[PDB]
Amino acid sequence: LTAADNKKRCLEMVDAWNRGELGGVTAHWSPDVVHHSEERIVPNEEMVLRMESGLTAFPDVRLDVRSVLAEDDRVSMRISVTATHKGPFMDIAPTNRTVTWHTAEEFRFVDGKVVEHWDVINYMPMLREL
Amino acid sequence: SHMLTAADNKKRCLEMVDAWNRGELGGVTAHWSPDVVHHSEERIVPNEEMVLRMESGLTAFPDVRLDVRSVLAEDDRVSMRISVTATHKGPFMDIAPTNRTVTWHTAEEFRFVDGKVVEHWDVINYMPMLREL
Known part of the structure; x- marks a missing residue:
């Protein structure tokens, strides 16, 4: 459907992630x-x-x-x-400290479903905390 | 602004990239x-x-x-x-140039008022370049 409907779908999925x-x-x-x-x-x-x-x-x-x-x-x-480092990452034991990283995501829709996805991820703020 | 302002802003962004590449x-x-x-x-x-x-x-x-x-x-x-994309031709972080081509990836966002960028956000993944130094 419309761009506004696709936007709502993406926000719903993120909200559902945070709310479990x-x-x-x-x-x-x-x-x-x-x-x-x-x-x-x-x-x-x-x-x-x-x-x-x-x-x-x-x-x-x-x-x-x-x-x-x-x-x-x-x-x-x-x-x-954002997350807490609670399990091993690259065999580095968890620090139990909060970490951050940044993403840009792009989604392409057909008939209300994401069929293609692109990311650009900056993990450096997290890697500095390992 | 009007309903075709977004199309104009898009045109301006593409013009700025083309201007960059042509020097x-x-x-x-x-x-x-x-x-x-x-x-x-x-x-x-x-x-x-x-x-x-x-x-x-x-x-x-x-x-x-x-x-x-x-x-x-x-x-x-x-x-x-x-x-x-670029060639590593000068020092980076005091590492001497490799003269090899490198690549990194960005996602940029621009907010326009009256045809000018007034706010800008980036997310940059430098890792594909850092792995080649």
Whole structure:
């Protein structure tokens, strides 16, 4: 549907992540999504491993949406990401301290579902705290 | 402003990238407010500090080029995803130049008033370049 409807879907999924509502977290993703990071396509299996390692280290991660823009079939978001270092990350034992990183996400929609996704992630503020 | 202002802002952003790549600095700077507010990593970066960052970066990467991968515009804002490419020709962090090509990725957001950028936000992933130094 419209850009405003797609924007609402993206905000709903982020809100569902923070509030722990799994139904809402996955509701608007297509089963066949193509992901991109650093100008390469990231196979979905590699994306899963990324998420697994990240959630082991940062299980309480939260997403603070700083802006969202939508036009035609695309939505872009800027997100401040915060977590506590509670599990090992790259075999570094948890510090139990809060960490931050920053992302920009872009989503392409078809029929109300995200079919393609791009990210730009600045992990440096977190890596400095390891 | 009017309903086609977003399209105009998008055009201006693309014109500024094209001006950068062709070496016409005034085609970039014409559309920025002198009182622009820059944000990076959830802090405001003073304009003088942004200039110093650019000076340091261009010393290392004097031929930097900007490849727009996406641009979106809505109301008074424009977002761009850009692939940044350069050759490591000068010192960076006191590491001698490798003379090899490097790449990093940015996501930029611009807020316009009357055709000028008055606020700017970035998210920059330098890691693909840092891994090659």
